[PDB]
Design a protein around this nucleic acid. Structure first.
Ligand SMILES: [K+]
Ligand SMILES: [Mg+2]
Ligand SMILES: [Mg+2]
Ligand SMILES: [Mg+2]
Ligand SMILES: [Zn+2]
Lengths: 142, 65, 76, 144, 100, 192, 117
RNA sequence: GUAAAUGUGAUCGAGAGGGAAUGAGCACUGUAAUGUGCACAGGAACGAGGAAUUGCUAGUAAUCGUUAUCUCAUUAAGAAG
């Protein structure tokens, strides 16, 4: 069954984030404490653990993609998902992508842990990454 | 024509050749009237907006709506 | 005079005595009756709602509303 | 009797860092934007290497906390702030990169413009007369 | 066995007549005959100012050329394909074939 | 989630036993139509008295989408009024709905000033307002009072809504809307 | 008092460097012009400068060198020379002093007279 | 380069609204930067506009983005959708 849809996103993304950090499965980019997520953003994130909320939300994008049986997700797709409206002085605001470097690092970390497999046209889940999510949800709803 | 230019490296002794890219008005003259302005380049027409409207009905364009 | 960034002991004492018999109370009341800033009206109000001295009745987006000891709702 | 136990410390009115005055009631982020050369972005960078909680007010900081920040301003490159975060990159006179603070900014811009004028650099001549130098059109806007 | 015949044309009345003519031919041979499939028309368009100079109220016109099309998918033996292809000439309609 | 009973406003408020309490207004104030959320798309505006059949709190949220920048932000208006009803229900102790009804009743001016002179110069005179125009002006004044009050003041907007509506229902001088109703009626009388 | 310096390098060293080395000092847009190679015109200008600095001796000045190579960045090989830069109307003369390094020849000549109503 | 307003939670607290002139840089297009992108500093007027004046009746006005539409090597604060 499509088990992921049974719980609310603003409870799931915070929940997994702790399981990640307590096992260090993803490691921060150099200068994560001062870098911005996009050229469209005004200031760096207010939470020091923003890198882990990215990791938690990336696995959610992949779980729902797997649930709906879509084509595999690309680095471009993820960059447009996290995009925003950039401020340009005296000109209309304009839609701009997220920066790729963060996303590339997360996907390469998850590859080394065996959580994400690279296909010829995108990235895909693996059995361990599915089962972690399954066993979390089964407690979390109860 | 794709014209070519010589250029020298920092030594001012070795030479290499580079190609000039075809861009701008210079080769996109109106096929009916040689004009350089208001040329419609879509659908591989190369005809100016003045010439288009007199020939449009011969080509087969119509104003439906 | 400008607003303040502490709730000193004697302001704290009298606020407890004043919050009973008040009906709906909100961030502004603490900041427009007494001299507290918005950033210290939030913190004190949140504290009293953990102590069961007040009770929260709405929290939709940032708009947040509370009730004291002489509140009473409608009845069917 | 119960006690609050969540109150800020007894606070000072204003304090001195950089031949500049900082309002003690102001929260450390927007407060360090008083010193010339500390913008918003770089203010957050320093505080997370000195390791001070962003939510304290400027008058609560000890001498120790003010020394921690003073040290990081005199030498950002020691505490792993990279050169692409700093005011003055690949200095024509020194080769090095450095971060200019307070009155150093105006002094450096002046000595630079003055040198160009001494040798007739057209860019420096325009800024002295109040004219524009980044290609902007001067017919319709920017009058008086 | 199978053939797919694309009749492509920038005139509607012609394509309607020629398809009715070919449909009649199909039903007169009776190989379990059927209608053509009406395809999404290709539409190429241009938008331009009417005046040859800047004077007056700027008035604009949209010209569009419509390429209609109809497909027959059909069952025939190779002789009947070779012989019937004599039908597919002297038309303002352009005619194209696919086979497997 | 919260309930499996009958339809109540915001799922909270009784929606029954409601009186207008001015026979001049009766037919023009819809407190019949049971709706869970003050939102409808019912296309009545293209009709002769169809804007009088729209429900009361609906007309009241529409009044908030103003000052230019807030055009179209109808969700925001619902968020605002929801909170105001909590403040009012608490403060007053009665169905917020009867506060809103009485605010309208008091805040509409009964006599007005107009140019009458046709065959010459246009000379101003008093005139008498219809039921429908009377309520249209009531909403307008209640809204205008709220907007301008909040502009550069530290108080929260849902709180200002509760301040004005109570006072208006109670016919007190304290209401911006009530004062301006007195002014119009006094000038009307001056030109009588 | 200290020797003239550009981005860390002394005039003695700087006057001895190849154009390829000097390129590691210059601003980004000037670097891109040297990476994309010199025109046939620019090469003649530079060879004349190298000839001139070599040929000149004593106290007599070398003759002026004229050029329509407006976008060329100034190089340590034309220090001390008198060079005429085309203004769209005339060869405007200037002497290439040390402080001009890191700029193009167009930066020191006006193609449009200053306006006073 | 495949929406944005928007939805929930935090935060900030009455020039933390606003981004104009300007500095030393880091890249891209191009035969050629003077054009464009990016990072850091800097922080001007403006606190709702005198006499006047322009459209708009319903999926309209106003708000919000987007153009495998046109210009187009690179350039939209322009039109046309
Ligand atoms: K202007
Ligand atoms: Mg902004
Ligand atoms: Mg700002
Ligand atoms: Mg134009
Ligand atoms: Zn022509």
């Amino acid at each position: 069954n499509t088990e992921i849809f049974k719980v609310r996103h603003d409870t799931f993304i915070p929940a997994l984030s702790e399981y990640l950090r307590t096992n260090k499965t993803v490691v921060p980019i150099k200068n994560f404490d001062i870098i911005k997520t996009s050229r469209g953003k005004e200031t760096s994130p207010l939470d020091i653990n923003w890198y882990y909320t990215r990791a938690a939300s990336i696995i959610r994008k992949l779980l729902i993609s797997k649930a709906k049986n879509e084509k595999p997700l690309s680095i471009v797709r993820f960059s447009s998902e996290y995009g925003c409206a950039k401020d340009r002085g005296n000109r209309p605001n304009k839609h701009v992508r997220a920066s790729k470097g963060i996303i590339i690092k997360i996907l390469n970390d998850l590859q080394e842990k065996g959580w994400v497999e690279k296909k010829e046209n995108g990235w895909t889940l693996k059995k361990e990454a599915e089962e972690v999510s399954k066993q979390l949800i089964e407690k979390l709803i109860n | 024509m794709n014209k070519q230019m010589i250029k020298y490296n920092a030594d001012l002794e070795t030479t290499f050749t580079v190609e000039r890219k075809d861009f701008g008005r210079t080769n996109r003259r109106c096929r009916a009237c040689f004009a350089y302005n208001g040329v419609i380049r879509k659908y591989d027409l190369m005809i100016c907006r003045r010439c288009f409207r007199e020939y449009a009905g011969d080509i087969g364009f119509k104003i439906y709506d | 005079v400008k607003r303040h960034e502490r709730v000193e002991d004697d302001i704290f004492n009298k606020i407890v005595k004043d919050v009973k018999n008040m009906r709906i109370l909100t961030r502004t009341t603490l900041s427009e009756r007494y001299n507290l800033s918005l950033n210290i009206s939030i913190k004190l109000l949140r504290f009293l709602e953990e102590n069961q001295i007040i009770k929260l009745i709405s929290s939709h987006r940032g708009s947040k509303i509370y009730a004291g000891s002489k509140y009473e709702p409608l009845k069917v | 009797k119960l006690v609050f136990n969540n109150n800020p410390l007894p606070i000072q009115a204003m304090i001195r860092m950089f031949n500049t005055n900082i309002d003690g009631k102001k929260q450390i982020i927007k407060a360090l934007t008083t010193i010339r050369g500390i913008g918003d972005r770089l203010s957050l960078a320093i505080l997370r290497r000195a390791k001070i909680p962003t939510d304290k007010r400027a008058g609560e900081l000890t001498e120790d906390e003010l020394n921690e920040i003073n040290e990081v301003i005199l030498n950002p490159q020691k505490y792993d702030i990279p050169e692409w975060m700093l005011n003055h990159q690949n200095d024509p006179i020194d080769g090095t990169t450095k971060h200019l603070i307070g009155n150093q900014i105006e002094g450096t811009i002046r000595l630079w413009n003055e040198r160009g004028k001494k040798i007739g650099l057209v860019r420096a001549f325009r800024t002295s007369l109040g004219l524009k130098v980044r290609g902007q059109r001067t017919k319709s806007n920017g009058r008086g | 066995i199978n053939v797919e015949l694309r009749l492509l044309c920038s005139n509607k009345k012609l394509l309607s007549d020629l398809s009715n003519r070919y449909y009649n031919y199909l039903f007169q041979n009776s190989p379990t005959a059927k209608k053509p499939r009406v395809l999404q028309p290709f539409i190429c368009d241009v938008t331009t100012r009417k005046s040859p100079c800047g004077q007056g109220t700027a008035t604009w016109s949209k010209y569009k050329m419509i390429i209609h099309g109809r497909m027959f998918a059909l069952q025939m033996t190779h002789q009947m394909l070779k012989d019937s292809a004599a039908f597919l000439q002297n038309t303002d309609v352009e005619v194209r074939l696919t086979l497997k | 989630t919260e309930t499996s009973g009958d339809i109540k406003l915001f799922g909270r408020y009784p929606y029954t036993d409601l009186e207008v309490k001015d026979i001049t207004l009766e037919k023009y104030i819809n407190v019949a139509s049971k709706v869970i959320l003050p939102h409808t798309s019912s296309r009545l505006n293209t009709k002769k008295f169809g804007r009088t059949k729209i429900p009361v709190v609906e007309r009241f949220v529409n009044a908030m989408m103003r000052k230019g920048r807030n055009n179209g932000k109808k969700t925001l208006a619902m968020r605002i009024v929801k909170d105001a009803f909590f403040i009012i229900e608490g403060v007053t102790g009665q169905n917020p709905i009867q506060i809103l009804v009485d605010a309208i009743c008091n805040s509409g001016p009964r006599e007005d000033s107009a140019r009458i002179g046709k065959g010459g110069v246009m000379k101003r005179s008093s005139v008498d307002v219809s039921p429908l125009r009377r309520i249209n002006i009531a909403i307008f004044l209640l809204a205008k009072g709220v907007r301008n009050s909040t502009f550069k003041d530290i108080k929260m907007l849902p709180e200002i809504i509760a301040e004005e509506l109570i006072n208006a229902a109670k016919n007190t001088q304290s209401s911006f809307a009530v004062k301006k109703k007195e002014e119009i009626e006094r000038i009307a009388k001056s030109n009588r | 008092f200290k020797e003239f310096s550009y981005k860390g390098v002394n005039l003695e060293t700087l006057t001895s460097m190849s154009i390829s080395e000097f390129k590691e000092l210059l601003p980004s847009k000037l670097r891109r012009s040297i990476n994309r190679g010199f025109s046939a015109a620019e090469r003649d200008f530079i060879k004349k400068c190298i000839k001139a600095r070599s040929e000149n001796t004593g106290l007599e000045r070398p003759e002026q060198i004229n050029t329509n190579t407006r976008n060329l960045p100034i190089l340590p090989t034309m220090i001390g020379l008198q060079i005429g830069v085309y203004s769209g109307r005339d060869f405007m003369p200037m002497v290439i002093k040390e402080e001009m390094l890191g700029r193009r020849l167009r930066d020191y000549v006006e193609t449009r007279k200053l306006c006073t109503h």
